[PDB]
Amino acid sequence: MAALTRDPQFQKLQQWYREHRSELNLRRLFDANKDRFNHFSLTLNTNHGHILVDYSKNLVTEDVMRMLVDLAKSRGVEAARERMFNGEKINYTEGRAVLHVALRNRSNTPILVDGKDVMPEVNKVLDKMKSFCQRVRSGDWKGYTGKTITDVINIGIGGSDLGPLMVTEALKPYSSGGPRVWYVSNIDGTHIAKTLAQLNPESSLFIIASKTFTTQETITNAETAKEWFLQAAKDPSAVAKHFVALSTNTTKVKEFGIDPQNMFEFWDWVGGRYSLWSAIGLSIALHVGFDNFEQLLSGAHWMDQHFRTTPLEKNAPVLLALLGIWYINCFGCETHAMLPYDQYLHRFAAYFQQGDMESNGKYITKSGTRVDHQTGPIVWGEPGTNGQHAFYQLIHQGTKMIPCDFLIPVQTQHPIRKGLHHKILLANFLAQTEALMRGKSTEEARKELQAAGKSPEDLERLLPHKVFEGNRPTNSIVFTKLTPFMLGALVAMYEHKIFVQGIIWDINSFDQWGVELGKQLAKKIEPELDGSAQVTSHDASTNGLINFIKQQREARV
Amino acid sequence: MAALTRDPQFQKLQQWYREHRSELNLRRLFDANKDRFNHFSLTLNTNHGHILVDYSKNLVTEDVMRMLVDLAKSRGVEAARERMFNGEKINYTEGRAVLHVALRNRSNTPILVDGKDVMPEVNKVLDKMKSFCQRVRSGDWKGYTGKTITDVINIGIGGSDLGPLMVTEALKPYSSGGPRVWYVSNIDGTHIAKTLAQLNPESSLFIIASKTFTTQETITNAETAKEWFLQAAKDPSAVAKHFVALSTNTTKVKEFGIDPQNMFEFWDWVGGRYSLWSAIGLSIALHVGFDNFEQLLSGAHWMDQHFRTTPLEKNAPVLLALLGIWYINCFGCETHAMLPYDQYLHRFAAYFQQGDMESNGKYITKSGTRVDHQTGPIVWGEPGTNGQHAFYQLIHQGTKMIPCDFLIPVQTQHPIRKGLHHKILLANFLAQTEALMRGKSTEEARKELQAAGKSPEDLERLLPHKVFEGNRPTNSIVFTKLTPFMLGALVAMYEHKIFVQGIIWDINSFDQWGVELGKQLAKKIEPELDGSAQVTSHDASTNGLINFIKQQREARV
């Protein structure tokens, strides 16, 4: 019995689910209350665009929403929120604070950990990034044969990769006068090799992104990259003009060969999957400039305040969270789809796949007790409308309930054909949620078939296949425009959604022990791969696999 | 009661699961049988590389596998298979043959549809494709100012987009001498605009890829591209030199303005999500050569044959399929992860996200009655090792059971650092499945913390967070090298996997009625977006959203 299954509010929610489940049909709910949208949507004015969070197409009623909020009061969301913002060490297994919110604390209101304000160091690195960006973008910083940097290569994996990648992709329109950026992460040699084959070492700046500076993929890639650079430059000292580091580890950085002046620092309280707001975002600032980088932080700060001062019942990240809890712990849905109707946000689903799953794919509570209820869902998605032709078929006519977040900006970065393309995009965005809610009844489909001139025969054989049972809930999140500021607010909104979920589940959203085992095991297998000798030191699958690898290494095809 | 649940073999399986599941533990199954790898693996020799399908780390015993095969027999998988290969119209709701096998039928064994061998029309398109490829790649085909083609842009969405995208990404190394390829698909203007901006119309060839040639996203992008092309060449006759079509609808192609000679055709028996093998695959052929395309087709041809002639119990796609049924229909897993340890295969999960989900995201059986069991799972994934740092945390220590397929080629296309990158990638590939299988007990974790010097209070608090329950099942799919041939075989292998599941569930994997409702509703909405009047014709949410979009399209941020 974990804290969540023991919570009376939680119990009350389950009870209600058992009793009224059948009473939750959207088409009826929307026919019965013409004011639904007005009662179940949030309109937020940031002063830099609006955000509409329309949760009306969800399987909920006021009564449900009330209990969901009560669950949050009962699980202590506010108090937990304050501990985070006050620099308390809520990452209780690592003994750490969780301060991504300090990285964008534009107010500079002091935040203390161990009785010491962090804003100065935070601001000191921001000033370093900023100067460095100016110098690189303007051409003041030159390579070893005196050329300006045309290409910047972030080398990192996970948290030291996905954020900078997703954000430079989403804000590509703001990169005029920026060097190109490349993201190398996989250990798979293809990644580094097909990237290096497209660069001139003279004009390439490598950024080695690593919190620990010991991660195997990143270090090997860094080393590989350094070796290629020296093949061309030959002089160790040229490295200082082409390699810089984003890390917390001055020593490992000093030993890799990087100039201590070339290290942009962050802190143990900056989680990787929460790190783009820090020195890790360097590549973002190089690409779109430091002012736009400041705009991104600044949008996170805005959402940070909203999370902090808004009553739970109207609080955006809190509501997205609770709806998730409703669907995960009462309805049992394993997944959550994130579907941005925006090509620029093509890695947005993937970024939150890491952010959500790495934070809440947990099973041990603060008391050290195994949970007896679900935790985080599997998160996935592709941008619309492409998905409409790929997997929406199953979302519409399969056997899974899939809560979905539809997102879109009102204004496109590219209003071609007098806005016709955006017009269509918007139309599909609106249409797909309508359809998923509404469905199409036997009779509706029947009337369609009659009007089409089908025989009662062909009609009878086809009829049942054109029926949509509807009642698939979605959220619709609409924003004026996708600028650096608005993106920051959005990214921040899901983060805090994730936090809330985690406090409700009594888990630690900020550690990630789950990665160790494979690593340890990887280190064991590496030396076992060299040589022709068969391997018998594991379970028979691992050996068989290894022996097939050795045998096939020799095949000519 | 659907065909599956009424079926006796299935009832036996459920019954076995009900009574034995508590005994399904990988550590113990492996400790008790040193022959498990030999007994639960398949090694196939294609004569162009070997495929080891290792399914020994699955929660199955000999009895379970025996009952699953029985189920395939009882459900009629072989007859169904034959009906497909013989041209029968098993795509019953549209009255269509399903013949993606005919497109890569290198044996030219006649395959008849309504009494006509289709092989000649298939081979004529192929010869035609080949002649075009040779003229385009060699420089013979000039643009409107006498320049050779340097860039090819495929315009299409879904089935006319993903395959060729995936395949070109995957075979990038075979593209020496080929023109660059670009894939425009989303209606979002960002896509065509950001692409056109990087193109010279004198050297760019467009391919409008569309089975129907009326899909809105595709025709519009096509119009946008044609308009853009015309602004520079100012000569309607130049279109013939820069625009070809891949479609089954000659009429609408003539209407669009594409010369009938510039039309590469296909047929209705080719499903979209099964079309890359056809004329839809022209961009593939352009990029890496007709020779390589041919190799892609034979690899698939080989797998078709393997699928057709191998007894069930040793048939790769059938076994993949049965394992899935077992996890879906007994265990209840909603998802299936595909995790290729290959950066070239970075779109592979996405491709089968469509192929699997669009095929078997269904709830209506052949008799026309609602299924009363689960069908298709949600498919998802990202290449390793990136995942180890993102969502693997959830796979290892969350609360969901997630069958995963790990794939890797033994031989890398880029053996840099004398193979060091590839050695590590393999080590991780191997160790991750070992770890999901084994876990790490409390006892084991304690010993590691004690050995690390942690205090009793340090160790006590951390210990349970470090425990891995294990028993997480995986398949490992290992193949000699990712050549065009092997790729064809692997894509074909999952294609037939999906087919088998579809047959077992008694659904139609080859229709997709689920896209219609949205399409209808978007046509309605388009016109209402024009102008600034409030809309009140839909449900309140659809209304509020439209109105909010109208309010905000005129905000200056």
Ligand SMILES: O=C[C@H](O)[C@H](O)COP(=O)(O)O
């Ligand atoms: O995503 C997980 C971590 O961010 C990833 O393992 C990289 O860690 P690092 O920043 O220490 O290299």
Ligand SMILES: O=C[C@H](O)[C@H](O)COP(=O)(O)O
């Ligand atoms: O995947 C679905 C179809 O392939 C897609 O809607 C495109 O259809 P089309 O090729 O006729 O344009």
